[PDB]
Protein backbone atom coordinates (compact mmCIF):
# COMPACT_ATOMS: atom_id res chain seq x y z
CA UNK A 1 0.00 0.00 0.00
CA UNK A 2 3.03 2.24 0.60
CA UNK A 3 5.82 2.52 -1.97
CA UNK A 4 8.89 4.69 -2.55
CA UNK A 5 9.12 7.08 -5.48
CA UNK A 6 12.09 8.05 -7.63
CA UNK A 7 14.41 11.02 -8.20
CA UNK A 8 15.39 11.24 -11.88
CA UNK A 9 14.16 14.76 -12.73
CA UNK A 10 14.00 15.28 -16.52
CA UNK A 11 16.72 12.64 -16.97
CA UNK A 12 16.69 9.95 -19.63
CA UNK A 13 15.87 6.45 -18.35
CA UNK A 14 18.84 4.36 -17.26
CA UNK A 15 17.51 1.42 -19.31
CA UNK A 16 15.10 2.53 -22.07
CA UNK A 17 13.73 -0.99 -22.62
CA UNK A 18 12.90 -1.63 -18.93
CA UNK A 19 11.56 1.80 -17.91
CA UNK A 20 7.90 0.77 -18.11
CA UNK A 21 8.65 -2.54 -16.36
CA UNK A 22 10.42 -0.73 -13.52
CA UNK A 23 7.52 1.73 -13.21
CA UNK A 24 5.04 -1.16 -13.04
CA UNK A 25 7.14 -3.01 -10.46
CA UNK A 26 7.46 0.12 -8.31
CA UNK A 27 3.84 1.30 -8.49
CA UNK A 28 1.79 -1.91 -8.73
CA UNK A 29 -0.90 -1.93 -6.05
CA UNK A 30 0.32 1.21 -4.27
CA UNK A 31 -1.91 3.76 -2.54
CA UNK A 32 0.58 6.18 -0.91
CA UNK A 33 3.81 7.24 -2.62
CA UNK A 34 6.61 8.13 -0.19
CA UNK A 35 8.51 10.35 -2.59
CA UNK A 36 8.04 11.87 -6.03
CA UNK A 37 5.79 10.49 -8.77
CA UNK A 38 7.88 10.76 -11.95
CA UNK A 39 6.09 9.47 -15.07
CA UNK A 40 8.46 10.24 -17.94
CA UNK A 41 9.20 8.87 -21.42
CA UNK A 42 6.03 6.80 -21.89
CA UNK A 43 5.28 5.57 -25.44
CA UNK A 44 2.03 6.21 -27.32
CA UNK A 45 0.40 2.85 -26.51
CA UNK A 46 1.76 2.40 -22.99
CA UNK A 47 -0.52 0.57 -20.55
CA UNK A 48 -0.57 2.40 -17.21
CA UNK A 49 -3.31 0.50 -15.37
CA UNK A 50 -0.97 -0.08 -12.40
CA UNK A 51 -1.20 3.59 -11.32
CA UNK A 52 -4.98 3.50 -10.74
CA UNK A 53 -4.61 2.81 -7.00
CA UNK A 54 -2.34 5.77 -6.16
CA UNK A 55 -4.07 8.16 -3.75
CA UNK A 56 -1.40 10.32 -2.06
CA UNK A 57 2.04 11.61 -3.09
CA UNK A 58 4.46 12.88 -0.45
CA UNK A 59 6.78 14.74 -2.82
CA UNK A 60 5.95 16.15 -6.25
CA UNK A 61 4.32 14.83 -9.42
CA UNK A 62 6.37 15.13 -12.62
CA UNK A 63 4.80 14.22 -15.98
CA UNK A 64 7.25 15.10 -18.75
CA UNK A 65 8.36 13.93 -22.21
CA UNK A 66 5.43 11.51 -22.57
CA UNK A 67 3.77 10.30 -25.76
CA UNK A 68 0.86 8.75 -23.84
CA UNK A 69 -2.48 10.33 -24.67
CA UNK A 70 -3.92 9.84 -21.17
CA UNK A 71 -2.30 9.24 -17.78
CA UNK A 72 -4.85 7.46 -15.52
CA UNK A 73 -4.52 9.28 -12.19
CA UNK A 74 -8.17 9.69 -11.21
CA UNK A 75 -7.94 8.56 -7.56
CA UNK A 76 -5.07 10.83 -6.49
CA UNK A 77 -6.35 13.08 -3.71
CA UNK A 78 -3.51 15.15 -2.20
CA UNK A 79 0.09 16.14 -2.90
CA UNK A 80 2.04 16.92 0.26
CA UNK A 81 4.78 18.88 -1.49
CA UNK A 82 7.59 17.77 0.82
CA UNK A 83 9.88 17.84 -2.22
CA UNK A 84 9.50 20.41 -4.99
CA UNK A 85 10.46 20.36 -8.66
CA UNK A 86 12.92 23.21 -9.31
CA UNK A 87 12.29 24.13 -5.64
CA UNK A 88 9.02 25.85 -6.59
CA UNK A 89 6.48 23.40 -8.02
CA UNK A 90 4.57 20.41 -6.67
CA UNK A 91 2.99 19.52 -10.03
CA UNK A 92 4.93 19.73 -13.30
CA UNK A 93 3.65 18.90 -16.80
CA UNK A 94 6.33 19.76 -19.37
CA UNK A 95 7.16 18.93 -23.00
CA UNK A 96 4.58 16.16 -23.47
CA UNK A 97 4.14 15.34 -27.16
CA UNK A 98 -3.61 11.31 -33.55
CA UNK A 99 -0.28 13.18 -33.47
CA UNK A 100 0.54 12.03 -29.94
CA UNK A 101 1.00 13.56 -26.52
CA UNK A 102 -1.39 13.77 -23.59
CA UNK A 103 -4.71 15.46 -24.31
CA UNK A 104 -6.32 15.71 -20.86
CA UNK A 105 -4.99 15.71 -17.31
CA UNK A 106 -8.00 13.90 -15.79
CA UNK A 107 -7.26 14.62 -12.13
CA UNK A 108 -10.88 14.79 -10.98
CA UNK A 109 -9.99 13.57 -7.46
CA UNK A 110 -7.09 15.94 -6.72
CA UNK A 111 -8.30 18.55 -4.24
CA UNK A 112 -5.41 19.60 -1.99
CA UNK A 113 -1.80 20.69 -2.48
CA UNK A 114 -0.11 21.48 0.83
CA UNK A 115 3.07 23.13 -0.48
CA UNK A 116 4.22 24.12 -3.96
CA UNK A 117 2.80 25.36 -7.23
CA UNK A 118 1.78 24.16 -10.70
CA UNK A 119 3.95 24.20 -13.83
CA UNK A 120 2.32 23.38 -17.19
CA UNK A 121 4.49 24.29 -20.19
CA UNK A 122 4.73 23.18 -23.83
CA UNK A 123 1.92 20.62 -24.19
CA UNK A 124 0.63 20.94 -27.77
CA UNK A 125 -2.31 18.52 -27.40
CA UNK A 126 -3.31 19.29 -23.80
CA UNK A 127 -6.68 20.91 -23.12
CA UNK A 128 -8.66 22.12 -20.10
CA UNK A 129 -5.84 23.68 -18.08
CA UNK A 130 -6.95 27.34 -18.11
CA UNK A 131 -10.48 26.45 -16.91
CA UNK A 132 -9.38 24.84 -13.62
CA UNK A 133 -9.58 27.06 -10.53
CA UNK A 134 -6.14 26.32 -9.13
CA UNK A 135 -6.73 28.58 -6.11
CA UNK A 136 -9.23 25.99 -4.83
CA UNK A 137 -6.69 23.15 -5.01
CA UNK A 138 -4.09 25.12 -3.03
CA UNK A 139 -4.35 24.98 0.75
CA UNK A 140 -5.43 28.24 2.36
CA UNK A 141 -2.13 28.31 4.29
CA UNK A 142 0.00 27.43 1.25
CA UNK A 143 2.88 29.91 1.03
CA UNK A 144 4.37 28.99 -2.37
CA UNK A 145 0.99 28.96 -4.15
CA UNK A 146 1.90 30.15 -7.64
CA UNK A 147 0.79 28.98 -11.08
CA UNK A 148 2.56 29.06 -14.46
CA UNK A 149 0.21 27.70 -17.15
CA UNK A 150 1.12 27.71 -20.85
CA UNK A 151 -2.03 27.46 -22.98
CA UNK A 152 -0.39 27.23 -26.41
CA UNK A 153 -2.16 24.54 -28.42
CA UNK A 154 -2.06 22.84 -31.81
CA UNK A 155 -5.73 21.77 -31.82
CA UNK A 156 -9.21 22.97 -30.86
CA UNK A 157 -10.86 21.48 -27.77
CA UNK A 158 -14.57 20.79 -27.49
CA UNK A 159 -16.39 22.34 -24.52
CA UNK A 160 -16.88 19.99 -21.59
CA UNK A 161 -20.26 18.60 -20.60
CA UNK A 162 -23.01 21.05 -19.56
CA UNK A 163 -23.42 19.09 -16.30
CA UNK A 164 -20.77 21.27 -14.64
CA UNK A 165 -22.08 24.15 -12.56
CA UNK A 166 -19.54 26.41 -14.24
CA UNK A 167 -17.02 25.75 -17.03
CA UNK A 168 -14.34 24.10 -14.87
CA UNK A 169 -13.51 20.60 -16.10
CA UNK A 170 -10.68 18.06 -16.13
CA UNK A 171 -11.86 16.58 -19.43
CA UNK A 172 -14.65 16.24 -21.95
CA UNK A 173 -16.67 13.64 -20.02
CA UNK A 174 -19.56 14.54 -17.74
CA UNK A 175 -17.85 13.00 -14.68
CA UNK A 176 -14.75 15.19 -15.20
CA UNK A 177 -16.44 18.07 -13.39
CA UNK A 178 -14.26 19.96 -10.92
CA UNK A 179 -15.34 19.91 -7.27
CA UNK A 180 -14.75 23.03 -5.17
CA UNK A 181 -14.01 22.60 -1.46
CA UNK A 182 -12.32 25.92 -0.55
CA UNK A 183 -13.95 28.92 -2.25
CA UNK A 184 -17.49 27.69 -1.44
CA UNK A 185 -16.92 27.25 2.31
CA UNK A 186 -19.15 29.01 4.83
CA UNK A 187 -17.29 31.12 7.37
CA UNK A 188 -13.57 30.59 7.92
CA UNK A 189 -13.28 26.81 7.59
CA UNK A 190 -10.48 25.83 5.22
CA UNK A 191 -12.29 22.77 3.83
CA UNK A 192 -15.96 21.94 3.45
CA UNK A 193 -18.38 19.61 1.67
CA UNK A 194 -21.06 22.23 1.04
CA UNK A 195 -22.10 25.88 1.39
CA UNK A 196 -23.66 25.42 4.85
CA UNK A 197 -21.79 26.22 8.08
CA UNK A 198 -22.42 22.65 9.25
CA UNK A 199 -20.71 21.32 6.10
CA UNK A 200 -17.21 22.39 7.15
CA UNK A 201 -14.64 19.69 7.85
CA UNK A 202 -12.55 18.91 10.91
CA UNK A 203 -9.45 21.04 11.45
CA UNK A 204 -7.20 17.98 11.02
CA UNK A 205 -8.60 16.94 7.61
CA UNK A 206 -6.72 18.09 4.52
CA UNK A 207 -8.39 17.26 1.20
CA UNK A 208 -12.07 17.23 2.20
CA UNK A 209 -14.54 15.28 4.27
CA UNK A 210 -17.70 13.20 4.21
CA UNK A 211 -18.75 14.11 7.75
CA UNK A 212 -18.05 16.70 10.46
CA UNK A 213 -16.02 14.25 12.56
CA UNK A 214 -12.26 13.67 12.37
CA UNK A 215 -12.65 10.03 11.29
CA UNK A 216 -14.60 10.48 8.03
CA UNK A 217 -12.43 12.73 5.85
CA UNK A 218 -10.57 11.97 2.64
CA UNK A 219 -7.09 12.80 3.96
CA UNK A 220 -5.27 13.56 7.20
CA UNK A 221 -3.57 16.95 7.43
CA UNK A 222 -0.76 15.74 9.72
CA UNK A 223 -1.13 12.09 10.76
CA UNK A 224 -3.54 9.16 10.44
CA UNK A 225 -4.04 7.09 13.61
CA UNK A 226 -6.01 3.97 12.63
CA UNK A 227 -8.58 6.11 10.85
CA UNK A 228 -8.32 9.16 13.14
CA UNK A 229 -6.75 12.42 11.95
CA UNK A 230 -4.45 13.62 14.74
CA UNK A 231 -1.97 16.49 14.94
CA UNK A 232 0.60 14.36 16.80
CA UNK A 233 1.13 10.62 17.05
CA UNK A 234 0.70 9.29 20.60
CA UNK A 235 3.88 9.60 22.64
CA UNK A 236 5.99 6.56 23.49
CA UNK A 237 6.52 7.69 27.10
CA UNK A 238 3.12 4.13 26.95
CA UNK A 239 1.22 1.03 25.78
CA UNK A 240 -0.60 3.23 23.24
CA UNK A 241 2.58 4.82 21.89
CA UNK A 242 2.98 4.78 18.11
CA UNK A 243 5.90 5.56 15.82
CA UNK A 244 5.77 8.30 13.19
CA UNK A 245 6.11 6.98 9.62
CA UNK A 246 5.30 9.49 6.90
CA UNK A 247 1.78 10.76 7.60
CA UNK A 248 0.55 7.86 9.74
CA UNK A 249 1.10 6.41 13.21
CA UNK A 250 2.36 2.82 13.27
CA UNK A 251 2.96 0.28 16.02
CA UNK A 252 6.45 -0.65 14.76
CA UNK A 253 8.87 0.81 12.24
CA UNK A 254 9.09 -0.83 8.79
CA UNK A 255 11.65 -3.47 7.87
CA UNK A 256 14.41 -1.18 6.55
CA UNK A 257 14.00 1.82 8.87
CA UNK A 258 15.62 3.08 12.06
CA UNK A 259 13.47 3.80 15.12
CA UNK A 260 14.44 6.98 16.97
CA UNK A 261 13.94 7.62 20.67
CA UNK A 262 11.80 10.60 19.63
CA UNK A 263 9.27 8.20 18.12
CA UNK A 264 9.75 8.46 14.35
CA UNK A 265 10.94 6.02 11.69
CA UNK A 266 13.94 7.47 9.83
CA UNK A 267 16.50 6.20 7.34
CA UNK A 268 19.57 7.71 9.06
CA UNK A 269 20.55 8.31 12.67
CA UNK A 270 20.63 11.93 13.88
CA UNK A 271 23.66 13.81 15.19
CA UNK A 272 25.52 12.38 18.20
CA UNK A 273 23.60 9.11 17.82
CA UNK A 274 24.73 5.55 17.12
CA UNK A 275 22.80 2.79 15.36
CA UNK A 276 22.19 -0.23 17.60
CA UNK A 277 21.12 -3.64 16.27
CA UNK A 278 18.80 -5.72 18.44
CA UNK A 279 15.29 -4.27 14.02
CA UNK A 280 17.66 -1.34 14.56
CA UNK A 281 17.37 1.86 16.59
CA UNK A 282 19.28 5.13 16.98
CA UNK A 283 20.39 5.04 20.61
CA UNK A 284 32.67 5.25 11.43
CA UNK A 285 33.41 5.13 7.71
CA UNK A 286 31.31 7.50 5.60
CA UNK A 287 30.58 6.72 1.96
CA UNK A 288 29.63 8.99 -0.90
CA UNK A 289 26.90 11.47 -0.03
CA UNK A 290 27.13 11.36 3.80
CA UNK A 291 28.26 14.64 5.34
CA UNK A 292 31.90 14.50 4.22
CA UNK A 293 31.63 13.23 0.63
CA UNK A 294 28.24 14.76 -0.19
CA UNK A 295 29.46 16.35 -3.44
CA UNK A 296 31.78 13.46 -4.36
CA UNK A 297 30.32 11.25 -7.08
CA UNK A 298 33.02 8.59 -7.58
CA UNK A 299 35.59 6.51 -5.71
CA UNK A 300 38.93 7.86 -6.94
CA UNK A 301 42.53 7.50 -5.79
CA UNK A 302 42.16 10.65 -3.65
CA UNK A 303 39.61 9.06 -1.29
CA UNK A 304 40.02 5.27 -1.62
CA UNK A 305 42.24 5.11 1.48
CA UNK A 306 39.33 6.33 3.63
CA UNK A 307 37.72 2.88 3.30
CA UNK A 308 40.79 0.87 4.36
CA UNK A 309 40.09 -1.69 7.07
CA UNK A 310 36.36 -0.98 7.21
CA UNK A 311 33.46 -3.37 7.81
CA UNK A 312 30.44 -1.07 7.37
CA UNK A 313 30.10 2.01 5.14
CA UNK A 314 27.56 4.72 5.95
CA UNK A 315 26.92 5.70 2.35
CA UNK A 316 27.16 4.50 -1.24
CA UNK A 317 29.92 3.37 -3.60
CA UNK A 318 30.01 4.59 -7.21
CA UNK A 319 32.66 3.49 -9.74
CA UNK A 320 32.46 5.89 -12.68
CA UNK A 321 34.72 5.67 -15.75
CA UNK A 322 36.57 8.75 -14.47
CA UNK A 323 37.66 6.74 -11.41
CA UNK A 324 40.08 4.58 -13.43
CA UNK A 325 41.45 7.32 -15.71
CA UNK A 326 46.05 9.57 -10.63
CA UNK A 327 43.95 6.76 -12.11
CA UNK A 328 42.80 3.99 -9.79
CA UNK A 329 44.70 0.71 -9.90
CA UNK A 330 43.44 -2.89 -9.55
CA UNK A 331 45.76 -3.46 -6.58
CA UNK A 332 44.14 -0.59 -4.65
CA UNK A 333 40.67 -2.20 -4.78
CA UNK A 334 41.61 -4.79 -2.11
CA UNK A 335 40.70 -2.30 0.64
CA UNK A 336 37.07 -3.46 0.21
CA UNK A 337 37.88 -7.10 1.01
CA UNK A 338 36.72 -6.58 4.62
CA UNK A 339 33.53 -4.72 3.66
CA UNK A 340 30.34 -6.45 4.79
CA UNK A 341 27.51 -3.87 4.73
CA UNK A 342 26.65 -0.87 2.56
CA UNK A 343 24.01 1.54 3.85
CA UNK A 344 23.43 3.05 0.39
CA UNK A 345 23.66 1.62 -3.11
CA UNK A 346 26.44 0.00 -5.15
CA UNK A 347 27.04 1.55 -8.58
CA UNK A 348 29.66 0.09 -10.94
CA UNK A 349 29.71 1.54 -14.47
CA UNK A 350 33.43 0.85 -14.97
CA UNK A 351 35.90 -1.85 -13.95
CA UNK A 352 39.51 -2.85 -14.74
CA UNK A 353 39.81 -5.16 -17.73
CA UNK A 354 42.23 -7.42 -15.81
CA UNK A 355 39.58 -8.35 -13.23
CA UNK A 356 37.30 -11.14 -14.54
CA UNK A 357 34.81 -10.72 -11.67
CA UNK A 358 33.72 -8.56 -8.72
CA UNK A 359 35.74 -10.63 -6.23
CA UNK A 360 36.89 -7.51 -4.34
CA UNK A 361 33.38 -7.56 -2.80
CA UNK A 362 33.70 -11.21 -1.77
CA UNK A 363 32.74 -10.58 1.87
CA UNK A 364 29.93 -8.09 1.17
CA UNK A 365 26.76 -9.46 2.75
CA UNK A 366 24.09 -6.73 2.91
CA UNK A 367 23.31 -3.83 0.59
CA UNK A 368 20.83 -1.89 2.70
CA UNK A 369 19.64 0.38 -0.10
CA UNK A 370 18.48 3.18 2.20
CA UNK A 371 19.76 5.56 -0.49
CA UNK A 372 19.02 4.52 -4.06
CA UNK A 373 20.72 5.52 -7.30
CA UNK A 374 18.22 7.68 -9.22
CA UNK A 375 15.79 6.81 -6.41
CA UNK A 376 15.09 3.32 -7.77
CA UNK A 377 18.25 1.15 -7.90
CA UNK A 378 20.51 -0.29 -5.21
CA UNK A 379 22.80 -2.41 -7.44
CA UNK A 380 23.74 -1.39 -10.99
CA UNK A 381 26.27 -3.08 -13.30
CA UNK A 382 26.53 -1.80 -16.88
CA UNK A 383 29.26 -2.00 -19.51
CA UNK A 384 31.69 -4.00 -17.37
CA UNK A 385 32.88 -6.87 -19.55
CA UNK A 386 33.09 -9.26 -16.58
CA UNK A 387 32.77 -13.02 -16.94
CA UNK A 388 30.92 -13.71 -13.67
CA UNK A 389 29.64 -11.82 -10.63
CA UNK A 390 31.42 -13.48 -7.72
CA UNK A 391 29.37 -11.85 -4.94
CA UNK A 392 29.56 -15.01 -2.86
CA UNK A 393 28.52 -13.58 0.52
CA UNK A 394 25.60 -11.41 -0.65
CA UNK A 395 22.35 -12.45 1.05
CA UNK A 396 20.01 -9.45 1.33
CA UNK A 397 18.98 -6.47 -0.79
CA UNK A 398 17.12 -4.23 1.64
CA UNK A 399 15.43 -1.97 -0.89
CA UNK A 400 15.50 -0.93 -4.53
CA UNK A 401 15.84 -2.84 -7.78
CA UNK A 402 18.81 -4.64 -9.32
CA UNK A 403 19.83 -3.54 -12.82
CA UNK A 404 22.40 -5.53 -14.81
CA UNK A 405 22.55 -4.64 -18.51
CA UNK A 406 24.98 -4.30 -21.43
CA UNK A 407 27.55 -6.75 -20.01
CA UNK A 408 28.38 -8.64 -23.21
CA UNK A 409 30.59 -11.23 -21.44
CA UNK A 410 28.51 -11.82 -18.29
CA UNK A 411 27.17 -15.30 -17.55
CA UNK A 412 25.76 -16.84 -14.34
CA UNK A 413 23.23 -14.00 -14.04
CA UNK A 414 20.28 -16.42 -13.74
CA UNK A 415 22.16 -18.89 -11.50
CA UNK A 416 21.70 -16.53 -8.53
CA UNK A 417 18.73 -16.80 -6.09
CA UNK A 418 17.59 -13.22 -6.63
CA UNK A 419 14.16 -13.79 -5.08
CA UNK A 420 15.78 -14.87 -1.81
CA UNK A 421 17.76 -11.60 -1.73
CA UNK A 422 14.69 -9.33 -1.90
CA UNK A 423 12.65 -8.34 1.16
CA UNK A 424 9.78 -6.52 -0.56
CA UNK A 425 7.11 -7.19 -3.21
CA UNK A 426 8.53 -4.27 -5.19
CA UNK A 427 12.09 -5.43 -6.02
CA UNK A 428 13.10 -7.26 -9.18
CA UNK A 429 16.09 -7.97 -11.40
CA UNK A 430 16.09 -6.04 -14.69
CA UNK A 431 18.59 -7.52 -17.15
CA UNK A 432 19.06 -6.86 -20.87
CA UNK A 433 21.79 -7.02 -23.51
CA UNK A 434 23.91 -9.53 -21.58
CA UNK A 435 25.68 -12.57 -23.00
CA UNK A 436 23.03 -14.96 -24.40
CA UNK A 437 22.18 -17.79 -22.03
CA UNK A 438 22.28 -20.35 -24.86
CA UNK A 439 26.02 -19.73 -25.26
CA UNK A 440 26.56 -19.45 -21.48
CA UNK A 441 22.52 -21.69 -7.41
CA UNK A 442 26.03 -20.27 -7.73
CA UNK A 443 27.91 -17.02 -8.33
CA UNK A 444 30.57 -18.29 -10.74
CA UNK A 445 32.61 -21.23 -12.02
CA UNK A 446 34.16 -23.63 -9.55
CA UNK A 447 33.05 -25.36 -6.35
CA UNK A 448 33.81 -22.30 -4.17
CA UNK A 449 31.11 -20.13 -5.79
CA UNK A 450 28.13 -22.17 -4.57
CA UNK A 451 25.35 -20.27 -2.81
Amino acid at each position, epitope marked *: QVCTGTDMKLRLPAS*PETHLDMLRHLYQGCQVVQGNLELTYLPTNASLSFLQDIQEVQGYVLIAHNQVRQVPLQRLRIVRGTQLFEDNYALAVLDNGSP*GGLRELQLRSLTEILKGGVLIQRNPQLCYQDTILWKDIFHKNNQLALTLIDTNRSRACHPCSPMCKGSRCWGESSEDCQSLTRTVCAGGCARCKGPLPTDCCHEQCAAGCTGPKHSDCLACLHFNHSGICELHCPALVNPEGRYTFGASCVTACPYNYLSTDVGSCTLVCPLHNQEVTATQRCEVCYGLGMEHLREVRAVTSANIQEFAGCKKIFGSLAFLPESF*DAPLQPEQLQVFETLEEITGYLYISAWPDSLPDLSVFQNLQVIRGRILHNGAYSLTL*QGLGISWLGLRSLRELGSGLALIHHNT*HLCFVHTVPWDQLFRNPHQALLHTANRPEDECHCWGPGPTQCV
Partner: nanobody
Amino acid sequence: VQLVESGGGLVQAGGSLRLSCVASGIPFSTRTMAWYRQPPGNERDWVATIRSGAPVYADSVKGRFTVSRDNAKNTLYLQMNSLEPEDTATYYCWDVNGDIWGQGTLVTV
Protein backbone atom coordinates in the same frame (compact mmCIF):
# COMPACT_ATOMS: atom_id res chain seq x y z
CA VAL B 1 33.01 14.91 -25.29
CA GLN B 2 30.51 14.29 -28.09
CA LEU B 3 29.27 11.56 -30.42
CA VAL B 4 28.30 12.16 -34.05
CA GLU B 5 26.33 9.73 -36.22
CA SER B 6 26.54 9.75 -40.01
CA GLY B 7 25.89 7.55 -43.02
CA GLY B 8 22.09 7.45 -42.97
CA GLY B 9 19.69 8.71 -45.64
CA LEU B 10 17.21 6.90 -47.88
CA VAL B 11 17.07 3.36 -49.26
CA GLN B 12 14.53 1.03 -50.84
CA ALA B 13 13.07 -2.16 -49.38
CA GLY B 14 15.59 -4.98 -49.23
CA GLY B 15 18.55 -2.61 -49.61
CA SER B 16 21.67 -2.04 -47.55
CA LEU B 17 23.15 0.75 -45.46
CA ARG B 18 26.20 1.46 -43.30
CA LEU B 19 26.25 3.72 -40.24
CA SER B 20 29.17 5.38 -38.48
CA CYS B 21 29.60 6.87 -35.01
CA VAL B 22 32.68 8.93 -34.09
CA ALA B 23 33.93 9.85 -30.61
CA SER B 24 36.13 12.85 -29.78
CA GLY B 25 37.62 13.50 -26.35
CA ILE B 26 36.96 10.11 -24.73
CA PRO B 27 39.04 6.90 -24.45
CA PHE B 28 37.14 4.97 -27.12
CA SER B 29 39.22 1.83 -26.55
CA THR B 30 37.96 1.34 -22.96
CA ARG B 31 34.27 2.08 -23.58
CA THR B 32 31.17 0.02 -24.32
CA MET B 33 29.11 1.15 -27.32
CA ALA B 34 25.44 0.42 -28.00
CA TRP B 35 23.19 1.08 -30.99
CA TYR B 36 19.57 2.17 -30.56
CA ARG B 37 16.60 2.92 -32.81
CA GLN B 38 13.63 5.21 -32.15
CA PRO B 39 10.61 4.56 -34.38
CA PRO B 40 8.29 7.57 -34.54
CA GLY B 41 5.78 7.71 -31.71
CA ASN B 42 7.51 4.92 -29.75
CA GLU B 43 10.34 4.47 -27.24
CA ARG B 44 14.02 3.91 -27.91
CA ASP B 45 14.77 0.30 -28.82
CA TRP B 46 18.03 -1.58 -28.35
CA VAL B 47 19.82 -2.89 -31.44
CA ALA B 48 23.31 -4.16 -30.60
CA THR B 49 26.15 -3.77 -28.10
CA ILE B 50 29.89 -4.44 -28.40
CA ARG B 51 32.80 -3.91 -26.02
CA SER B 52 35.79 -6.06 -27.07
CA GLY B 53 34.68 -9.28 -28.80
CA ALA B 54 31.55 -10.85 -30.25
CA PRO B 55 28.73 -8.28 -30.07
CA VAL B 56 25.26 -9.06 -28.74
CA TYR B 57 22.34 -8.46 -31.11
CA ALA B 58 18.62 -8.07 -30.54
CA ASP B 59 16.33 -10.90 -31.62
CA SER B 60 14.71 -8.72 -34.30
CA VAL B 61 17.95 -7.75 -36.08
CA LYS B 62 19.95 -10.93 -35.42
CA GLY B 63 21.41 -12.39 -38.60
CA ARG B 64 20.89 -9.25 -40.72
CA PHE B 65 22.98 -6.63 -38.88
CA THR B 66 26.71 -6.69 -38.17
CA VAL B 67 28.42 -4.36 -35.70
CA SER B 68 32.15 -3.63 -35.75
CA ARG B 69 34.45 -1.02 -34.23
CA ASP B 70 37.79 0.57 -35.10
CA ASN B 71 39.71 1.69 -32.01
CA ALA B 72 42.45 3.47 -33.97
CA LYS B 73 39.93 5.64 -35.84
CA ASN B 74 37.72 6.06 -32.73
CA THR B 75 34.74 4.99 -34.84
CA LEU B 76 31.90 2.50 -34.43
CA TYR B 77 30.15 0.95 -37.43
CA LEU B 78 26.71 -0.54 -38.04
CA GLN B 79 26.30 -2.49 -41.28
CA MET B 80 22.69 -2.97 -42.39
CA ASN B 81 21.53 -5.63 -44.85
CA SER B 82 18.17 -6.97 -46.03
CA LEU B 83 16.37 -3.86 -44.80
CA GLU B 84 12.64 -4.00 -44.09
CA PRO B 85 9.88 -1.36 -43.99
CA GLU B 86 9.75 -1.82 -40.20
CA ASP B 87 13.41 -0.72 -39.89
CA THR B 88 12.70 3.00 -40.40
CA ALA B 89 13.75 4.82 -37.23
CA THR B 90 16.18 7.37 -35.84
CA TYR B 91 19.40 5.53 -34.95
CA TYR B 92 21.36 6.66 -31.89
CA CYS B 93 24.91 6.09 -30.65
CA TRP B 94 25.27 5.50 -26.91
CA ASP B 95 28.33 5.30 -24.66
CA VAL B 96 27.29 2.87 -21.93
CA ASN B 97 30.08 3.57 -19.43
CA GLY B 98 30.15 7.36 -19.74
CA ASP B 99 26.39 7.77 -20.34
CA ILE B 100 26.83 9.88 -23.48
CA TRP B 101 24.10 9.90 -26.13
CA GLY B 102 24.52 10.78 -29.78
CA GLN B 103 22.38 13.23 -31.71
CA GLY B 104 20.95 10.53 -33.97
CA THR B 105 20.58 9.93 -37.70
CA LEU B 106 17.44 9.32 -39.75
CA VAL B 107 17.05 6.10 -41.75
CA THR B 108 14.02 5.60 -44.01
CA VAL B 109 13.35 2.37 -45.90
